[PDB]
Amino acid sequence: ADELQQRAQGLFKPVPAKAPTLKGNPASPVKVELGKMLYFDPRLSASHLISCNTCHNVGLGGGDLQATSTGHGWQKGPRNAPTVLNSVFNTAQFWDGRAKDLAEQAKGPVQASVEMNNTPDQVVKTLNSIPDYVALFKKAFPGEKDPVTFDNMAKAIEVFEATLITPDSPFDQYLKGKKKALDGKQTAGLKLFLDKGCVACHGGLNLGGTGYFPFGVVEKPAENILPLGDKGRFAVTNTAKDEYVFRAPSLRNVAITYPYFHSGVVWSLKEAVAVMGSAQFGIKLSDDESEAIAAFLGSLTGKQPKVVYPIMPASTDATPRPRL
Amino acid sequence: ADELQQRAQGLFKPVPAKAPTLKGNPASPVKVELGKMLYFDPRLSASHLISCNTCHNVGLGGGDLQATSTGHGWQKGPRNAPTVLNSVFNTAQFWDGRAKDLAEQAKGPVQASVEMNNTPDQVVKTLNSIPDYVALFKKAFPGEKDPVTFDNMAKAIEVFEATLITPDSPFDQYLKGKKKALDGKQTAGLKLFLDKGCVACHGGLNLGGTGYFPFGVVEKGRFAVTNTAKDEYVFRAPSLRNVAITYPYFHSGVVWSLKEAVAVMGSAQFGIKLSDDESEAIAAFLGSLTGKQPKVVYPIMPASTDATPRPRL
Ligand code: HEM
Ligand code: HEM
Ligand code: HEM
Ligand code: HEM
Ligand SMILES: [Ca+2]
Ligand SMILES: [Ca+2]
Incomplete structure (x- = not known):
């Protein structure tokens, strides 16, 4: 009643x-800014075509309007892309699997996707070849002698996803x-x-x-x-x-x-x-x-989140080109 | 010096x-808001996979970082995507061709793209199946009884592009x-x-x-x-x-x-x-x-309904 x-x-x-707090991965305006740029940057993929927004579309409900799609290495075959919105709150990271596989499986949606669509050495080379991304990683990951790493690239992105609520x-x-x-x-x-x-x-x-x-x-x-x-x-x-x-x-x-x-x-x-x-x-x-x-x-x-579209910085002569 | x-x-x-005036297609907040949704809306394509931003990507200098792509039905083969930025001020609409051919070529970036990736019947049907879009077309184009037209979809998009300067x-x-x-x-x-x-x-x-x-x-x-x-x-x-x-x-x-x-x-x-x-x-x-670079807020685009056509397989 x-x-x-x-x-x-x-x-x-x-x-x-408020965006929740991520263990090992503190929030800051600069990190949210970096994480937004990479989430939309298709240079994370080898083809220079696929960003996370391609399948996880912020103006369409955080998904992609398709039956199925293949974005992450652990996928059993084609699977319907779940929404990025409120994803920060979930703990079942995987659609489906053997219950014993699922208990010891490593977490990391960003690393599973990009190691599928590219190789990390080629992504880090991309990020180091552009002075603005390098500067950003320094402000966002203050202690590190070299902050431009594949796992920092995943941390920035996740601090961005945690605003997507x-x-x-x-x-x-x-x-x-x-x-x-x-x-x-x-x-x-x-x-x-x-x-x-x-x-x-x-x-x-x-x-x-x-x-x-x-x-x-x-x-x-x-x-x-x-x-x-x-x-x-x-x-x-x-x-x-x-x-x-x-x-x-x-x-x-x-x-x-x-x-x-x-x-x-x-x-x-x-x-x-x-x-x-x-x-x-x-x-x-x-x-x-x-x-x-x-x-x-x-x-x-x-x-739905008001997402101002990131202005991503220009490649340079040192930047990997779209993979043939 | x-x-x-x-x-x-x-x-x-x-x-x-400031955005220049387009003859016969006046700017308004609502028309701009509508033309933005449709420029990011992959449901213009029959597969529901491609939008204008896909190749004229607003955070990446308005192009697509590729050597070549095929977005418009006048293209005889793949061509480099020109930037959408300051596109409003150009008059040479096509990259290349026989000079005579081009003189007779129908213009309209929006029409030539959506006609390649879909048909006008299917796009109109899609826009008509979402109450929110019908409502927007009537506010943006009050001078028409049925404003949900292929021509008005192009107009809305173009008044949005006119801001991308x-x-x-x-x-x-x-x-x-x-x-x-x-x-x-x-x-x-x-x-x-x-x-x-x-x-x-x-x-x-x-x-x-x-x-x-x-x-x-x-x-x-x-x-x-x-x-x-x-x-x-x-x-x-x-x-x-x-x-x-x-x-x-x-x-x-x-x-x-x-x-x-x-x-x-x-x-x-x-x-x-x-x-x-x-x-x-x-x-x-x-x-x-x-x-x-223009500061663009990602549009929030309205959900399909049971009447909206499915992705073309
Ligand atoms: C690096 C960019 C990407 C990010 C940040 C991202 C984010 C995510 C997240 C967070 C999940 C888990 C949702 C949850 O745990 O509740 C997930 C699953 C999934 N995403 Fe992505 N994604 C990315 C790239 C893509 C792309 C490009 C595609 C499509 C081609 C895709 C399609 C999928 C699919 C199909 C699943 C379900 C996989 C399964 O569990 O079977 N993702 N993604
Ligand atoms: C009448 C009560 C229920 C309703 C309305 C409901 C609703 C839904 C909806 C709408 C989905 C699809 C969501 C998506 O694709 O994002 C879903 C999927 C699912 N739900 Fe339920 N649910 C109900 C009861 C349950 C119960 C009792 C269980 C578990 C014992 C359950 C477990 C599942 C599972 C495993 C899926 C995914 C199945 C697949 O994707 O193949 N649900 N449910
Ligand atoms: C309806 C959404 C789209 C709009 C509004 C649009 C806008 C435009 C504009 C305004 C031009 C000419 C610029 C000028 O004349 O200065 C152009 C040309 C071009 N666009 Fe698009 N575009 C759209 C979709 C796409 C897509 C999805 C692709 C790629 C798959 C694409 C790739 C191209 C290419 C290659 C050209 C050069 C065509 C040639 O003259 O050979 N466009 N576009
Ligand atoms: C030193 C003087 C010039 C400079 C710095 C220059 C610069 C450029 C640049 C940077 C491009 C590539 C633009 C793009 O891809 O977006 C271009 C293309 C082009 N320019 Fe020039 N330009 C010069 C002289 C000329 C002259 C005198 C003409 C005409 C008589 C001309 C006509 C063209 C044409 C037709 C293209 C396109 C050709 C193709 O894509 O195959 N340019 N120019
Ligand atoms: Ca779904
Ligand atoms: Ca170019």
Whole structure:
């Protein structure tokens, strides 16, 4: 009644009003500035075509609008790019894998991408060949006799990503005290999200982002007889038999990071809900129910970051050229 | 020193302090905001992978750092992406072709690109499927019942491009009065650029971008100017504003060093000979043509809907 406001408040938290602190990697204006430049600089790739913004697009929800894509070395094959927004809050860094692999695997999205699209010696040569980047790395990494390294390049970038957060969605304003930040169908959909137990895998600060479960969405085999992207076509499979797992993704800003699941197979938010009303979980959902949940998930879209586009410095005669 | 300064004030003009008016397509905040969203919006392309910023990248001197790409349907083969910066002040719209051919070639950078990577039916359908874009087109183009048109999409983008201009280069501050805006080597470069006659093809407000000439840079100190008048074939003499930041050079992106492009240009075909030092002086001068990069806020672009077409596979 507002047991509901108080329950939601227990199970969830709003996005804070400050970039969180990164262990080993302190924030500063200069570092945020460097990290912004590199995030958009396609010179990190060997071709000089691909930046992190290519797939992780700040004006499109932090994603890329594609079913799948291949950006990071650890990827099992093509996978739907998750959003960069609020990524700083997640702890499940990987879409999917054997549960034993996933526990000892090294973290580092920047290093996995660039060692895929280039080699670090060629990236560091790029950065050292440009007097402005060198100056920036000195201000951002004050103690180091040589601050221009592949791992510092990843640290700058990550201090930038940690500014890419989306506070003050309608739902966080509801968490913060204001019942009327949610409308009545949003409020009803919150109620089902909770009672139907979505909150179990999709809960917390980020509404997911934090656990692996032995369940994946699959395209069911026989028939050509239903619209492309209809729920009829997709189901949850149980993957415990093979000690295999998937992350239960953060649901923040889900309404703007379509298409959905690890394979990008469902375009409709109502439908991605209907698929999740799965028996594998003991969850049953009526049309009406899946529609109110998706309404509640609409309330998850926060303030999108105002990102002034970095003016990146000119290559010099010493700068590697696009790889043939 | 006073003679040089007046001579330059004579032959060139600074970038204006503000977006020039485009006949039949007036600026407004909303039209500018709309044209920005669409210039960054990869849903103009059928694959939803390419936007204008992809190759005319606003933080990278308005080009794409590649030798060649294919963005417009008039291109017969891959060509170096010219900067979008100060593009508004140019009149020579195409890189190269038979002079007769180009005379009849339909213009419109926006139309020719979106027609290559998609069709107008599919783009219009995409814009019509997002309430937020329909709402914006009606505010920007109130004089029309259905303002969501291929022609108006191009207009919005162009009024945005008209803002992507680069005032206050060291050269421009020299033209407005301050002699010391230019250093000693830069000043010596200017005298040479004038005296050797670069300014014939690269003069006025944008230092080129206005004429076609029967000279092209081809494989021959590897590359050289070639006379193409016998084929009735022409190339644009590109605007040199921001040339230092828009490598590689020429139509085919064959030359990466700005000192080497100046040396290729010091060609017998025009009657110019340049020494090693002379090319270096002038290169220093071209260095003073880089202006203030525009401060652009990344647009926040509106989500597709169930009616929006999917990526073309
Ligand atoms: C160095 C630039 C990049 C950065 C900073 C970056 C950032 C990230 C981050 C932070 C994650 C994890 C999200 C989370 O943990 O919640 C991730 C995963 C992913 N990113 Fe990127 N990315 C970059 C380049 C790219 C590119 C260029 C592409 C596309 C061609 C791409 C596609 C992907 C995909 C498909 C995943 C999911 C991989 C998987 O777990 O299967 N990334 N990226
Ligand atoms: C009815 C309640 C639920 C709703 C509305 C819901 C919602 C969603 C949505 C919208 C997605 C796709 C997100 C994206 O692609 O960014 C998703 C994926 C997923 N969720 Fe749920 N969820 C519910 C219950 C659960 C439960 C109970 C579990 C775990 C036991 C779970 C685990 C997962 C997993 C593993 C994925 C990724 C599957 C894949 O990508 O192949 N969800 N969920
Ligand atoms: C609709 C988005 C785009 C806009 C507004 C745009 C803008 C322009 C403009 C204004 C010009 C001529 C500049 C002048 O005449 O001074 C130009 C030429 C050119 N652009 Fe684009 N561009 C767009 C998309 C792209 C894309 C996606 C690519 C690359 C894949 C591209 C590559 C090129 C190339 C190669 C030329 C030289 C064409 C030639 O004359 O041979 N453009 N562009
Ligand atoms: C020493 C005097 C000159 C200098 C410093 C010079 C400088 C330049 C530069 C730096 C470029 C490359 C611009 C770019 O890629 O964005 C260029 C190209 C070009 N310039 Fe000049 N220029 C000079 C003389 C001339 C003259 C006298 C003409 C015409 C009669 C001319 C016409 C052209 C043409 C047609 C191109 C494009 C050719 C191609 O891309 O293949 N230039 N020039
Ligand atoms: Ca997605
Ligand atoms: Ca160029």
